[PDB]
Structure formats: C-alpha cells, structure tokens
Ligand binder design. Structure first.
Ligand code: SF4
Ligand code: SF4
Ligand code: SF4
Ligand code: SF4
Ligand code: FES
Ligand SMILES: [Ca+2]
Lengths: 905, 146, 585
C-alpha cells in the first residue's frame, strides 16, 4: 500500500492496521491496549491520528490507528496539534487516579505508562480531587498484585482468557471501578501466568521472585540465553546484579517464543542463586574435603587419571554440546556414555530418526500456530513442553480466525473474530494416561494406557492409509471415534502430529510417525513435533554414546577405574542403589557440576562447573535448531576466590594436562570448530552465532544498559580499588557498558530491548523489522537438518492391549511443570508452588486394596520401600498407578515400568 | 439530549427540525426545568447518573466523567477554581461522536455543553477560590509559574 | 518564529555566492539548529571553497573550529551524504557578523583530507588533534603528530569503537614512560639547527608548574636569552571531556561542563545548557536569563580577579594576589549562598536553574558591589600603574588585528587590536540585550599590559551589569514550563504523579533530545567558548565538541614570542588568561 504520513511517502502492508504499520516504520505513536499477539480492541483511546479524506484536506477526522487499516493512498498525520492534544488528554485522564507509587513500584524504569506519559509531553497536573484505590489480591508466589496502578486497558484479560486459555482472571465492576483479577484469593492456575508481567503496561502484575531481590532495569546485566528447563529452548534474557541472577525476561525470537515464556522457564531460575553450589574445586583426601584453585586441581586430576587403566565419561542432556564433546574428547568416543538410560536413549534416537529422516517437515514453534488440526499422542504438552501447548491453543483458535477472515474481518479485529467464532474451533485430539490441561479446548481426549494410546495412533494411521499395519481388537464406538479423528485430519490443509519421549513408550512415537507418514501420503501439508525431556536432549542424541546402564556395568565389572560425571546427578536415569554401588566400587570419581548432587559424597574430585548464567555454549532444542547461550556475568568479579569455570573449559584443560602436562584454558570458538570438524552432523552449530571477533562497526555488544550505575561503589565494601572489567574472550559480548545495543545494529543476538523513549518490553517493536514479525536481520538460531527427501517406512510392530496383571502395577507418568525438571525443583520458590507427592489410583483399585483418598500406602521398587498419600484419579485405567515423574525419589526413568508390592502402610 | 431555551420552544418535534437546532429529538418525552431548580445541581445529577451507569470500557468517558462530576460537585459547594469550565469544554470536545467507543458519552455531555452554552453565568458563580493544586513543602522553594 | 527552530539558511548571501561560483550541485545544505549555514562540501573542493570564502568582499577571516566526527553509529542521517567520518570547519566573518560550517564527508578506508594550514595557520593544532583522536590524516601537514596523547599510544580515543573507561594501571608502563622521560633529539619535534651556532641552549619550561594555569611543557631554544624556536607539548591535562560527553546523559554531563575551564564555572555551564535547550526546543523565561547572566558575571569577575592577581604576581608584586583572593572569597560567599558550592557549582539546568534564589542573596550582592570598586582602584594604584610593571609588560609579545584573526585569538586579545567583536553584543544570548554595558577595545596593539587593562575594564563592566541586575529584579519561575525541563520543579515532583514520572525518567534514563545538531557560542571569561552538540535521538550526546579560546592562544604562543626573552615568555604566559584544562579538555 501507500500512506502519506506528514507528507512523507511510506510503503506498508495493506492488511496491517495503521498503528502497527506506523510502528514498523519507526514512527512513534502512543498506545496501551494494542498488543501484536493479542489483536485489537480499541479501549485505551491512545493511538489517535488525524486522517484526511484526500490530499488537500484541512479539518480531517480524528481516528483510531489500531482500528484503521493501512489502505492504499491513506493520508494521516501524527504530529499535528489536534492529535497530540487528544493523546495528551488521554494520558492526563489515565493520570487522574494513578497512585504516587513510581519509587516503590517494580515497573519503574520498565513501565509502558511512564514511557507514554513522557512521550506525549504531559508533565503538569491540574487534577486536585481524590484518587480511587483498590485492595490487592494474592495471586500466589509468582505474580504480585497491585490494582491501584491499573489503567483498564484490558490486555491482561485478553491475553489470559483468549490467548492463554485461562479461566480464573476476569474484569469485575463497571465505570472506573473495574477490577482485574481472580474472583477470590488464590494462585493463578495458568502455566503462562508469568507473561502478565510483560503484557500489563503498568505495575499491577509484577514478578514476585524478582521483587524479593529487586533492582531496576538499568542496573541489570543482561545476556541472551536459552532456557534450560525443558527441550523447547525459548530465548530468554537472564539479568543479574551483585553476582546473583535476578530476573528472566522474555527475549524476542520470531521463530520460537516471540512474546511468551512459561512459568517454569520464567520462575525456575532460583537454583543458580543457591548457596550450596560448588564455587571452588574440592578434593577429598582421607575425609577432608580440601579446596584447590584451578591449576593444582587440573594437575592432580590429570595425574590420577594418568595412572588409571581406563577412564569413562558420563555426560548429561543438561550439559551443552561443547561440554559433552569435551568430555567425549577427554575419554574417547568409545568410553563416552550418555547419561540417560537405555529406554530413554532408544526413544530419543527414534524421535531424532523421525525428525531428521522421516521426510516430514518439523515445524517451528511460531509455525505451530498456523496448523488446522492437531493430534497429540501420548505427550502431556502443558506439563513438559508448555509453550507448544500455548501454540496448540493458538492453532485451535485458528478456525475462528479463518471463519472471521472469510467474512471480511481482518486478523487484528480479535473481538469480531471471537464474535464470528463463538464456539467453533479447530480439531484437537489429545491422548494421555489421564486428563490434560488441553482438554478444555480439545475435540477429544483419550485416557488410556500408553499401549492403548499407541494402538489408537496405529488404528488412525491404518484408517488414513491402508498400507499401514492394521489393528485388531478395536471396540466399535472407539472405531467411530477413530473415524471422526480421521475425517478431521483428512479434511485439514495442514495437520500436525505431536508426540514425544515423555510418555515412556517407543510405540507411541512409532504410531505418531506412521500417522504423519499416512497424512503425508495423501498429499497433506502434515507436520510432526517431538517433545524431548532436557534442554540438550536432541544434541546428546545426535552426538550419541552408550547408555547409563553400560557405564554402570563398566564401573561394576572393574574395567573402568575412573569415572567423570558431567553435570549429571545419575539418579534420574538409573536406580540409586546401583549408581551408589558402582560409584563406591570405582576408586576415582570426578564430578564436573554446578549443582550440589548426591553423588558428590562418593566423589573424589568435584570440579565446580558453571551454570547457564556463568557459561556459554550451544544447545539443540526439540526441533533440531542449534542455539547459542552466552555468559551473563563473571562469577569471580565479586568473590575473587571463586573458581567457577565452564564445563568444556574444565574438560579441555584436563585433556591438555593429561596429554602434554600443562593447563590450556581454551576459547569457545576452538571447541565449536572441534565439534564441527569431528562431528559432521553437528556442523550447523557454527552458524548459530558469530564468533568472538564479531563487531558492530568495530565495537562489541554491551551486556548492560547505558545507565548502569554504582560501578565505583558496587564492590567498594570489599576494596575501594575498582577491579578488572571481566574480559570475554569467548563471545562477541562484553561485561560492560562499552558496547553496542542499537536496534538497527546488523546482529541477531539481542541481550535486552531498549530504545530511547521505549524502556518497556515494547522496545522489541523497535528491534523488529515489522512489529509482531521476525527479529530484524534474521532470528537467531539455525536448524541442523533439513527435511529429508525420502521418508521412513511404516512401523509394523503394533503393540498388544494392556492386560492388567495381578501383583504388578504399570507406572503412569504424571508430569508437573513445577517439579519435573530437576534444576527447577532446586529453586526455593518452586517448593511452595509444587504439589505434595501423591500416588494416583483408580477407584476400582482403591476398592480392591480397601484404601481411601489421602491414605499413606507404601510400595517397594529396587529394594526400597517408600510411602506416599493416595489421590483417587477417575480418568486413570484399572491396573495402572499414577506417579509424579521428576520428584525426589521418583525418577522419570520409572515411567512405563512395573511396580511391585502396592499395599497400605 | 441537549437542553433548549424558550426561543427553541416554537420549533416542531421532528428529526431534521431538531437536527439543526443544536439538539436531538430523542424519545420525544421532554422535561421542563423551572427557575427554582438550579442548572448546576441538575447537570451534576445528570453527569453523576451517566458516570455511575457508564460501562467503563474506553478511557475518555470512564476517566473523564468522574472528573466532570467532581468539578460539578465543587461548583455546587462554591469550591470551583479557575480552570474548571475550560476543563468541561475540553472534555466535551474530546467526547464527541467517534471520539469515544460508542455514543453513550456524546449523549452524556450533550446536557453539559448545552448548559454551558445557554447558562454559563450560573456556572461561573461557583468559582470562588483560586487554583491551588499544590501545598507548600518546607525546604523547597516553589516554581512561581506565570 | 522560535530561535531554536531548525533552519537551512538558504536565504543567506554566502549560500547564493557559493551557488553562483561552484554551481548548484557542488554542495549539500543541511538544515540544523546550529543557527549557522551547514554546507557539505566535496573533499576535492575544500581548498577552493576555503580560498573563495577567504577572498570574499566581506571575507570569512577566522577559522573558529576544526574537528572530526565518527558517523558510523549515527542512525538519523536523512538528507546527508554517506559518510563513515566527517571533518567540520567552522569559519567566522566578523564583518558580516556571520559564520559558516563546512563539512567534508569521508570513507572508512580513505581518511585523507587536504590540509587547511595554508589558508588558516591556526589549523595546525586542530588537525593534529583530529588525527590524534579520530585517525583522520591531513595530507600536506608539516608535522602531523599526536597532541593530546603520547606518541606511543595505540588507537584513536574519540572513535566510537574505542573503550572510554580507564584501562588497568600497570607499573611496567610507568617505568617505561619514566625511562622515556629520563632518556628524553631536536629533530622529531620539527626543530632545526641542533646547536649549530654553539650557543643554542635547550631548556624545558614544564611540565610541572608553580602556577594555577596548569601543567604543560615548552622546549625553549635560546641564543643566550633570545628565543629562537619553541615547541609546546600539550596534553598533560587531557580528561576525555568529549568522550565523556558521549558517555553521560544530557543532564548528568553538566558537572563535566563545569570543569572545562575551572576558573569559569557557570560561564562554562552556560553554552552547554543553551545548546541542549536548542536541541529540546526550550525557551526559558526572562528571570532564568537574568539569574544565569548574574551568575556568569559573578564568575567572570572571579576569574578576572584571579587573572589580574596572577599577572601581578608574575611581574613580581605579591600583595594584590592576597587582596584579590579576599575579594574572590566575597564572591565565593555569595556563590555558596546561591548554589551551595564555591568553584564548580553545577547549578544550571536544562530549562532553568537548580533552585530558586535564597532569601537574602541581595544583601551579599550589595556588600560585594560596595566592597569591590575601592579594592579595584587600590589594585590599579598599587601595582597596575607601577612603571616597573609597565616596563615588564608594555610592548611585550605584541600582535595586530591580522595576527589575531589568523590565529583565532578571541576575547581580550582580539579586542586589544581594535576589533570590537564581543559575543554578548554581536550575537546576543540569554537576555544580554536588556543590560546596558560597554565593550572595551584597544588601540590596535595587543600587548600584555593592554590585555590586562582591557580585562580590568571588563571587570568594571561586569560590576555595572551586576548593579543593573540588582536594581531591576523580574519575578517569575526559575525553571521553564517545557516537558523537557530537566529536572522538573521539586515540589510538583514530590506531590504530582505526572511530574514524578517525568522526573523518574529524566534522572535515570535521561531526557530524550530529538535528533538534531545544535551550537551555542558564548563569551567566556578567557575568550569565546562554544558547545557543538549532535544528538542521535538518544538520552546521551552522540557528539560533544567543545571549542575553547585557550587552545588558539597557546597555538599563537610560538608566533608572537620569537626573538624575545624568557622573562618576556613568563609575562606572556601570565597575560593570556589561559588554563590548561581549557586547552586540553
Ligand atoms: S505502574 Fe508505572 S506509572 Fe504506575 S507507579 Fe509503577 S512505574 Fe509509576
Ligand atoms: S491490570 Fe494491566 S493489563 Fe490489565 S487492564 Fe489493568 S493496566 Fe491493562
Ligand atoms: S516451554 Fe520449556 S524452554 Fe520454554 S520457557 Fe518453559 S521450560 Fe523454558
Ligand atoms: S463511551 Fe461507551 S464504550 Fe466508552 S466507557 Fe463510556 S459507556 Fe463504555
Ligand atoms: S491502541 Fe488503539 S485505542 Fe488502544
Ligand atoms: Ca565465558
């Protein structure tokens, strides 16, 4: 199209509204109620521009730019006096009841309302009457509530209800007494309640975890990183102050996690600030855990490895590509073992084979929202890959969007979208051992054991295409439901099959692969998504290695007398007794870790590794996209005796000391080159981010904002002499003010969004090419593998029915967003949000044992009896028993396994 | 709807006839205000009804009708200050058809602008004290604006 | 029309003359808020344009400024030629009372500009500073070496890709530079005749000095007592003020403007806040102008008292320094009452001053106005009419109007030559039109004694301005009614949410100046001071250029001292009224 803004010609998209078209061009228009993801409602009355009918018009007409489409030849004015007077008046009306709270408000310096008050030029108050006040509700441990600061812009209710699909946040009252919150006191039950701290333009919803140890946005040292709490790999901005990780802000990625994270990845960062973490290397001599610096620890470790007959290495899916590869070089690729069990590794390798050899295009997380039918097989998406569940909700509302678009309604008229789309929505068929959080919008939910879920998928694949292996033993009404699912998937333009490794069944993955292949063979634009468990599970699968059982047999037989455990607690993937016995038999245990685990008591040496906040590296997400995360802060800047190095740095210097008897603290780009030389299937991680020589017109990228304060006084209590600015030889970033964070800088790794006049999270509008689109100069991250030309073949191994045998109980995994990822359970703010460990039972099974709800029953697995209180699950099937995966004592490896001696305590 | 005077009484009740008369036909159920009822209290009650019964969706009506209500409350008690009638005109100009989300607020401030246009002398009688928005802070010299 | 409006100055006669001479497509006129016509000239035509402006019927006789600009990080460059770097030349025509700003665009690979020293001889130090801080090489320069940093310095500090903060102190660098000092060849400095007459004695006059003007070094070559050649080595007072201007906000840079000429104070604050108000669109009220003029005149009297006392001490009389410092203590009592600080008050603000005047300032001003003139007459009769002082001063280091124009000499040295050019009259700023004061001028020779007597007369006129200000007091605000007045008035901040929001964002992120270019030129205590500010639309200055007169005066030091004595050199240094912070900044 063509618009005339103050006489200047501009070329914009004709389908866009005028506010987003003018914001894409860099023009500044105040706005509150419009969000790029939530659509438009036109409440705040802030985006007024004067539109003219033709080229020569004097009076014009004041119009709302978030309702006005950017049609061809549209003449508007922004800076003329009438529009500025109206926008200043609207800001003034918002400022009548606003509390005098900016010094004691967590949004100060990060406030959209402050930015728009300053931008409109309104600074003189002529209101002398009283201001309305509101009582503050309790929203739980994550979100702090303060309703005095609200401007009634309706963004919270729009996001939480329409977008996030929540049910316990609403607007109450009329006129100026509108109240936004829950009907009563309680925790916000949505898994994406944390995004309200960025959706809300004011300080109504604030980060309570940040509020405990609060600092302003200009004082925060930011870095671009990847969230380490599940396999989705949402881009984040961890920001620190005074040596502790303070906040996790959302980092815009137009491909993955544009405006939204989940609650686990926003509030589960508290394990970094734990005081029991190893900070210096520790050697156990006799029973004395003495403390070394880096050099003597490396020398002694290299010696004690040098007179050992065989050294094995147990990596982890928590660790990065570089650290696992450095361990692989240290011990040799024959003696390198992945830290996961055999069944988990089999499921992970099958998921990788489906992704990179199945011939079906795996979609990006932003691209999930543009699919017409979703079949989720076996994966509890909301509890394991929650952001994928949010994107699935968007794809389900896509039917209402399409129905509105068929009747001359644009995509930003979300009110008309919901008016036309009353209750019609895209088909969603979720399958699990119990009820999920997607069942409120799902067209069908199938509660069945994982064998029966796999059989459902196999029957769907056979009904879609007769070349798939058939299933015998389908009940007729279940067959009618298969026909309904097949009719929904066949009529869809873009179907999407979502599975993963969390179900604990290979056959569900095989069934999802066969459904995707059958839909591909009909000519549909089918996509397949696979949810892995940990942050770098796909990278560990691509790198490969032996399973944990092989390493345990090597330690127990005596062929290996030296074990190097990299960032693995070893109890989540194997039984505790076997791991403890194997590590007790081994005369040399060396744990390279950043979290105090149970295996460090048996460890002979502990290398204090760094977490994601104090290290760089590359992680591969569930879609196969390599993503680089950078160090946020130097740990030794505040505590000089802290020796907390990168895991790959520790292992590379250990290998160098073992070989040539000197320490070699390498550079990250050297390890990247070693990975892309030794491992050609990981050769794409070089393009994930540019190397340390990357500059923007000669200068590096600044970690901290321009107004970083206190630099001559933040360490003055230790010494009045200012220390060294920490030098970053690994990355293109600097630990200082002196860098570049321009929105027009030719770069993709943006540490934080800030623009002059835009201090809120709305500065991402300045950092994007067009608002709500991609990051300018491309989104960061690169896919490792392309879609294969030829696919796989149909998996003929159709599993049998689940037969409940007496005395044996099938463990059904019940994942929790707060409690399954180990590092998140380490966080102290998650210990109040997580539920108490309850064992889930069928009513028929509870009647058979004669136990009621809440009774403590004991069960013995691997020779250890543990007691749990019983919760009655109606959606479970008979012969199964529900257990919470990931909690203390209940490893996620227990999923899909039998359980013995289920009796009342 | 807008208030009208005795000069507008000799005018037929149609749609277009009241269209250029500066008012609306409405429901054609008129109400007469005599000399005993002061227009300040009447406009205060009208705006109080239109503010407590507004829907509160969009910013200008929701956050400006209470401002006009408080201004009229001050003018009732004689606590008006210089900068109140101009505030009423600015609010009415910024509350026109399409300036708000719907037409409830233009109908809300039609009586306000009508009583301003025809009975401005009854509203200026409520302005008695000078404009004092700030209070003196001991230790800080105020900026004497001119 | 506001005085801060963005103008292109296409109606200026110089633009029409350039169009008629070089053609309508030889240059690009930029619309700025500097108040001067800014013309982008091609690099090859720079010398031709300089000669054409030098040979006009009313020529541009003074090169006011010459420096560089790193344009790589500048985003808002609409209507501008493509430049990674640029070199700007500010030229002044006194006869027209006009000035032009030529700008030469460059590229990152070819940073080679023709030298300007053949047209204006005072371009030598400016081009040495531009090469030192920006790496821009000037072809044809006679001696293009570093002037602010040591010769063994890696990098050019004013480039955008240079780390502004201090690097770590190392004792090895200290020992290496001490070795350089101990083993510190009269050929690398441009000197000739390395003791060819068997009497060419070499001495070092600095760098440490028993004087308040600062620290700097001159290497003197003498035939007996006669100076034959002198190479001044400056940069012993470099503080990175412009690099700090790129590192502080628009509001938190005012203390750094205070220490540019540390005897000036509010006089140094004045052009910076006026230029930021040009960038912000702020027209301050008349009471603000009156207050700022009062404090500028008080600090001018303070600086002139220090200069006269220092000159009299340099000649040899040691009592008037004690008496003039007692008078300076009276001025400091008044300034302490008004602002709360003696020498660096940091009191001017964007859009006004920090606080209102305290209740009782007029009593101290009346005390000082009664105290001062009798002491001034005592100073004159006791030392300034002494014939020994006159013999030490008169006819020593003299120059005419041509030498003052060709070296960019401004202030008392310029007006001692008969050139009646004062900024407070020629280009009146901050309400100086409302005060009745005279401009003292010389007879045509700028001696040491003539400059000292002109500074005495300037002190008398500043006292007259203070009397006229004390008699007539306007009443009103001490801060402007603009949304960009930084900070807002304090009581409204303490009890109004809009004012609190504006204060919160202005004192933390900074005020956002829209992307423009501003320039303010004022009459400093020591000459003509100027702030040239480029905003990229951010809360910090994209470029801060400070032109100081002491730079030009120290560049004129070798031109007027050849063939004189060392005592004449000491008297000349004492009679310039310079400080080393002004030169090096
Ligand atoms: S929400 Fe914004 S405007 Fe309101 S008190 Fe907080 S920082 Fe100030
Ligand atoms: S609570 Fe926040 S997001 Fe919700 S209406 Fe109020 S200002 Fe808007
Ligand atoms: S969905 Fe996974 S990767 Fe994304 S924020 Fe949540 S825990 Fe982190
Ligand atoms: S003008 Fe209408 S939509 Fe707006 S708040 Fe008032 S009653 Fe509601
Ligand atoms: S952004 Fe358009 S009215 Fe709210
Ligand atoms: Ca690092």
């Amino acid at each position: 199209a063509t618009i005339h803004v103050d006489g200047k010609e501009y070329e914009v998209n004709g389908a866009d509204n005028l506010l987003e078209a003018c914001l894409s061009l860099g023009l500044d228009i105040p706005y509150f109620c419009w969000h790029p993801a939530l659509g438009s409602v036109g409440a705040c009355r802030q985006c007024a521009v004067k539109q003219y009918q033709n080229a020569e018009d004097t009076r014009g007409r004041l119009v709302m730019s978030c309702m006005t489409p950017a049609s061809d030849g549209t003449f508007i004015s922004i800076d003329d006096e009438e529009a500025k007077q109206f926008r200043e008046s609207v800001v003034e009306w918002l400022m009548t009841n606003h509390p005098h709270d900016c010094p004691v408000c967590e949004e100060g310096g990060n406030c959209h309302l402050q930015d728009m008050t300053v931008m409109t030029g309104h600074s003189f108050r002529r209101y002398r009457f009283t201001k309305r006040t509101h009582r503050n509700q309790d929203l739980g441990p994550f979100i702090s509530h303060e309703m005095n600061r609200c401007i009634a812009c309706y963004r919270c209710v729009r996001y939480y209800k329409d977008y996030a699909g929540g049910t316990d946040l609403g607007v109450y009252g009329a006129h100026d007494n509108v109240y936004f919150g829950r009907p009563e006191d309680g925790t916000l039950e949505s898994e994406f309640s944390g995004n309200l701290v960025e959706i809300c333009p004011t300080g109504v919803f604030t980060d309570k975890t940040h509020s405990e140890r609060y600092n302003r946005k200009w004082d925060m040292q930011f870095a671009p990183s990847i969230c380490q709490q599940c396999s989705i790999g949402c881009n984040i901005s961890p920001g620190e102050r005074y040596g502790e990780l303070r906040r996790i802000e959302n980092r815009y990625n137009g491909t993955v996690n544009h405006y939204f994270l989940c609650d686990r990845g926003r509030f589960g960062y508290g394990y970094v600030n734990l005081k029991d973490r190893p900070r210096q290397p520790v050697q156990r001599r006799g029973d004395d855990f003495i403390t070394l610096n880096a050099e003597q620890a490396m020398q002694g470790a290299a010696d004690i490895l040098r007179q050992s007959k065989k050294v094995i290495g147990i990596g982890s899916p928590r660790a990065s590509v570089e650290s696992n590869f450095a361990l692989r070089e240290l011990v040799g690729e024959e003696n390198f073992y992945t830290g996961i069990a055999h069944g988990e590794q089999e499921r992970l390798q099958l998921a990788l084979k489906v992704l990179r050899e199945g011939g079906i295009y795996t979609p990006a997380l932003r691209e999930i929202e543009s699919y017409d039918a979703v079949l989720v097989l076996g994966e509890d998406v909301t509890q394991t890959g929650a952001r994928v569940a949010l994107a699935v909700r968007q794809a389900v509302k896509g039917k209402a969007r399409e129905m509105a678009a068929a009747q001359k309604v644009a995509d930003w008229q979300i009110a008309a979208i919901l008016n036309i789309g009353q209750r019609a929505k895209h088909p969603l068929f979720v399958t699990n051992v119990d009820d999920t959080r997607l069942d409120d919008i799902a067209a069908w939910t199938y509660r069945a054991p994982v064998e029966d879920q796999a059989r459902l998928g196999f029957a769907i694949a056979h009904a879609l295409d007769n070349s798939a292996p058939a299933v015998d033993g389908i009940e007729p009404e279940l067959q009618s439901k298969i026909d309904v699912i097949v009719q929904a998937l066949a009529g869809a333009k873009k179907p999407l099959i979502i599975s993963g490794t969390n179900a604990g069944s290979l056959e569900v993955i095989q069934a999802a692969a066969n459904v995707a292949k059958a839909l591909k063979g009909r000519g549909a634009d089918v996509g397949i998504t696979m949810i892995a468990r940990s942050v770098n599970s796909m990278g560990l699968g691509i790198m490969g290695g032996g399973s944990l059982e092989e390493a345990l047999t090597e330690l127990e037989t005596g062929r290996a007398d030296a074990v190097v455990v990299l960032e693995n607690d070893l109890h989540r993937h194997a039984s505790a007794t076997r791991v403890n016995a194997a590590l007790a038999k081994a005369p040399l245990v060396m744990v390279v870790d950043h979290q105090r685990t149970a295996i460090m008591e048996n460890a002979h040496l502990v290398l204090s590794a760094a977490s994601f906040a104090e290290s760089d590296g590359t992680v591969i997400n569930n879609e196969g996209r390599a993503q680089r995360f950078f160090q946020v802060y130097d740990p030794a800047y505040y505590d000089s005796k802290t020796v907390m190095l990168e895991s790959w740095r520790w292992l590379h210097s250990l290998h160098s000391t073992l070989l040539s008897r000197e320490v070699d603290w390498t550079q990250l780009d050297h390890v990247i080159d070693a990975v892309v030389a030794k491992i050609p299937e990981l050769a794409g991680i070089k393009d994930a981010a540019p190397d340390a020589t990357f500059r923007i017109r000669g200068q590096k990228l600044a970690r901290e904002p321009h107004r970083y304060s206190g630099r001559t006084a933040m360490r003055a209590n230790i010494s009045v002499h200012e220390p060294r600015q920490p030098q970053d030889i690994d990355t293109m970033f600097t630990f200082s003010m002196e860098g570049n964070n321009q929105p027009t800088a030719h770069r993709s790794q943006v540490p934080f969004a800030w623009a002059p006049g835009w201090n809120s999270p709305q500065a991402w509008n300045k950092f994007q090419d067009e608002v709500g689109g991609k990051l300018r100069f491309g989104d960061p991250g690169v896919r490792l593998f392309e879609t294969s030309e030829n696919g796989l073949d149909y998996f003929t191994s159709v599993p049998a029915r689940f037969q409940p045998q007496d005395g044996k109980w099938r463990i059904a995994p019940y994942y929790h967003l707060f409690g399954s990822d180990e590092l998140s359970q380490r966080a102290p703010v998650f210990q109040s949000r997580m539920p108490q460990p309850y064992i889930k039972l069928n009513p028929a099974d509870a009647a058979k044992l004669g136990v009621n709800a809440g009774t403590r029953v004991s069960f013995s697995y691997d020779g250890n009896t543990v007691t749990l209180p019983v919760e009655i699950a109606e959606g479970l099937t008979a012969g199964q028993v529900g257990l919470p995966m990931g909690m203390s004592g209940i490893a996620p490896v227990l999923a899909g396994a039998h359980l013995e001696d289920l009796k009342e305590a | 709807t807008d208030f009208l005077t005795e000069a507008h009484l000799d005018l037929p009740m149609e749609f277009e006839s009241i269209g250029k008369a500066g008012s609306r036909l409405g429901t054609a159920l008129a109400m007469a205000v005599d000399h005993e009822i002061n227009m300040v209290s009447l406009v205060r009650n009208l705006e109080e009804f239109f503010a407590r019964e507004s829907c509160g969706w969009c910013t200008p009506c929701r956050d400006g009708l209470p401002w006009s209500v408080k201004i009229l409350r001050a003018l009732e008690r004689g606590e008006g200050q210089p900068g109140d009638i101009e505030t009423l005109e600015q609010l009415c100009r910024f509350l026109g058809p399409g300036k708000t989300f719907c037409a409830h607020a233009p109908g809300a401030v039609e009586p306000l602008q009508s009583a301003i246009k025809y009975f401005r002398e009854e509203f200026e009688a409520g302005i008695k004290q000078p404009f004092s928005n700030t209070h003196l802070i001991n230790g800080i010299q105020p900026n004497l604006l001119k | 029309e506001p005085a801060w409006q963005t103008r292109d100055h296409l109606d200026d006669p110089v633009i029409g003359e350039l169009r008629n001479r070089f053609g309508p497509d030889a240059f690009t006129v930029q619309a700025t808020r500097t108040g001067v016509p800014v013309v982008w000239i091609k690099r090859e035509q720079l010398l031709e344009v300089g000669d054409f402006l030098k040979k006009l019927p009313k020529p541009y006789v003074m090169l006011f400024d010459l420096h560089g600009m790193d344009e790589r990080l500048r985003t808002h460059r609409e209507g501008l030629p493509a430049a990674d770097f640029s070199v700007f030349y500010h030229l002044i025509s006194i006869d027209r009372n006009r000035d032009i700003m030529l700008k030469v665009a460059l590229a990152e690979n070819d940073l080679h500009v023709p030298t300007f020293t053949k047209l204006f001889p005072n371009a030598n130090w400016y081009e040495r500073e531009t090469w030192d801080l920006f790496g821009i090489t000037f072809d044809g320069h006679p001696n293009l070496r570093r002037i602010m940093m040591p010769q063994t310095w890696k990098g050019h500090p004013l480039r955008k890709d240079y780390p502004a903060r201090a690097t770590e102190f190392s004792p090895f660098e200290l020992t290496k530079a001490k070795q350089d000092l101990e083993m510190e060849k009269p050929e690398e400095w441009g000197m000739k005749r390395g003791t060819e007459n068997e009497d060419f004695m070499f001495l070092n006059l600095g760098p440490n000095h028993p004087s308040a003007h600062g620290a700097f070094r001159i290497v003197l070559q003498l035939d007996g007592e006669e100076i034959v050649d002198c190479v001044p080595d400056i940069g012993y007072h470099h503080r990175g003020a412009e690099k700090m201007g790129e590192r502080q906000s628009w509001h938190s840079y005012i203390p750094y403007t205070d220490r540019i000429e540390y005897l000036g104070g509010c006089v140094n604050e004045m052009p910076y806040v006026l230029a930021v108000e040009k960038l912000a669109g702020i027209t301050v009220p008349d009471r603000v102008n009156v207050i700022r003029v009062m404090l500028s005149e008080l600090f001018r009297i303070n600086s002139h008292l220090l200069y006269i006392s220092t000159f009299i001490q340099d000649v040899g009389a040691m009592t008037p320094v004690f008496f003039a410092f007692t008078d300076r203590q009276k001025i400091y009592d008044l300034v302490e009452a008004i602002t709360g600080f003696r020498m660096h008050p940091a009191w001017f603000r964007i859009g006004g001053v920090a606080h209102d005047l305290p209740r009782g300032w007029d009593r101290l001003l009346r005390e000082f106005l009664d105290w001062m003139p009798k002491r001034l007459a005592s100073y004159e009769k006791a030392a300034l009419q002494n014939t020994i002082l006159k013999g030490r001063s008169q006819g020593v280091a003299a120059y005419g109007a041509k030498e003052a124009l060709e070296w960019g000499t401004t202030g008392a040295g310029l007006r001692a030559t008969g050139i009646d050019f004062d900024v407070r009259k020629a280009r009146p700023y901050s309400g100086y039109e409302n005060f009745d004061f005279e401009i003292p001028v010389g007879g045509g020779v700028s001696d040491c004694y003539t400059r000292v007597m002109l500074k005495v007369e300037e002190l008398r006129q500043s006292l007259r301005i203070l009397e006229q200000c004390l008699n007539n007091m306007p009443e009103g605000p001490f801060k402007a009614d603009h949304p960009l007045t930084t900070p807002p008035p304090k009581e409204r901040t303490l009890q109004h949410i809009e004012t609190l929001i504006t204060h919160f964002l202005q004192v933390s992120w900074g005020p956002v100046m829209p992307a423009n270019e501003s320039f303010q030129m004022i009459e400093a205590t020591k000459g003509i001071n100027s702030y040239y500010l480029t905003s990229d639309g951010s809360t910090m200055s994209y470029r801060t250029r400070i032109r100081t007169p002491s730079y030009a005066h120290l560049q004129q030091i070798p031109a007027a001292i050849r063939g004189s004595l060392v005592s004449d050199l000491i008297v000349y240094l004492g009679s310039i009224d310079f400080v080393m912070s002004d030169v090096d900044r």
